[PDB]
Amino acid sequence: HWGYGKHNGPEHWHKDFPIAKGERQSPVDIDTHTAKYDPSLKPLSVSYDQATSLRILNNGHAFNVEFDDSQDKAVLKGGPLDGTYRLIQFHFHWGSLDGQGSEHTVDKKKYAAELHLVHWNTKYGDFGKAVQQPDGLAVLGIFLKVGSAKPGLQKVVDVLDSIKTKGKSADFTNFDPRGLLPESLDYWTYPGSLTTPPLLECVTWIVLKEPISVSSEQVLKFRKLNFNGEGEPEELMVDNWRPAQPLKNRQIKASFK
Ligand SMILES: [Zn+2]
């Protein structure tokens, strides 16, 4: 099945998901000098105050924190978006070394990790129908830099031991995702895809300019997770990032001068 190793990694994905070679694939490198100020972009509207987190799951290539998406409780609007999108999950991708890990790059600079907050367009009724639509998903991408610890990440860090191996899940209530946001909400935006199978081209990407810092010891605990299931041989969960894909016929717009 697909993964991130030598024999089943991103260079092999096209064999089972030919959209891997499509026209609007993600991630991409963000060339800050050719991105375009768009003054018609509205500011982002992030409303996470009523968010209801449910649980945390090792799914064998990352770890997801899931949310109640049966009602408008944690929503994203504004920006380049038309309509309301509900938060369904967030996850991270990260590297084996501090100098790699992010999926998007900025002027070919790699960050230590990226946070992806996945939202779907309520217009379409359920998440399964949203992913079939050009404007079905909106993912908010946030870069992580190694520096001072991020307090609001620590509750995620401390539960990771209970979901070491693939398939394990733990109750994870009352987590507030506002602790993960940077100070500024300036961003770049472009149309893209999921970065993992099935790589559907259904995503409006919103990548924040400002990284958040986490400590060396927080990201170490990410790296002690396990791709394998319990009882299987131990593969450390690291380098679960897809390399940048050609921009082709797309333009990256910025919300800031
Ligand atoms: Zn992701």
Curated annotation (Swiss-Prot):
Regulation of protein activity: Activated by X-ray, histamine, L-adrenaline, L- and D-phenylalanine, L- and D-histidine, L-His-OMe and beta-Ala-His (carnosine).
Annotated GO CC locations: apical part of cell; cytoplasm; cytosol; extracellular exosome; myelin sheath; plasma membrane
Enzyme Commission number: 4.2.1.1, 4.2.1.69
Listed result of changing L194F: Normal activity
Domain of life: Eukaryota
Result when mutating H61W: Impaired activity, rescued by 4-methylimidazole (4-MI). Impaired activity, not rescued by 4-methylimidazole (4-MI)
Pfam families: Carb_anhydrase
Effect of E114Q: Strongly reduced activity and sulfonamide affinity
Molecular function GO labels: arylesterase activity; carbonate dehydratase activity; cyanamide hydratase activity; zinc ion binding
Positions annotated to bind Zn(2+): H91, H93, H116
Mutation effect (N59D): Strongly reduced activity
pH effect summary: Optimum pH is 6-8.
Cytoplasm among keywords: yes
Record-linked Gene3D superfamilies: Alpha carbonic anhydrase (3.10.200.10)
Effect of H61A: Reduced CO(2) hydrase activity, rescued by 4-methylimidazole (4-MI). Reduced proton transfer. Enhanced proton transfer. Enhanced proton transfer capacity
Cofactor(s) this protein cannot do without: Zn(2+); Co(2+)
UniProt xrefs under PANTHER family: CARBONIC ANHYDRASE (PTHR18952), CARBONIC ANHYDRASE 2 (PTHR18952:SF120)
UniProt disease annotation: Osteopetrosis, autosomal recessive 3: A rare genetic disease characterized by abnormally dense bone, due to defective resorption of immature bone. Osteopetrosis occurs in two forms: a severe autosomal recessive form occurring in utero, infancy, or childhood, and a benign autosomal dominant form occurring in adolescence or adulthood. Recessive osteopetrosis commonly manifests in early infancy with macrocephaly, feeding difficulties, evolving blindness and deafness, bone marrow failure, severe anemia, and hepatosplenomegaly.
Protein role: Catalyzes the reversible hydration of carbon dioxide. Can also hydrate cyanamide to urea. Stimulates the chloride-bicarbonate exchange activity of SLC26A6. Essential for bone resorption and osteoclast differentiation. Involved in the regulation of fluid secretion into the anterior chamber of the eye. Contributes to intracellular pH regulation in the duodenal upper villous epithelium during proton-coupled peptide absorption.
Assembly: Interacts with SLC4A4. Interaction with SLC4A7 regulates SLC4A7 transporter activity. Interacts with SLC26A6 isoform 4 (via C-terminus cytoplasmic domain).
Further information: Target of drugs used in treatments against glaucoma disorder and breast cancer.
Protein name: Carbonic anhydrase 2
Provenance organism: Homo sapiens (Human)
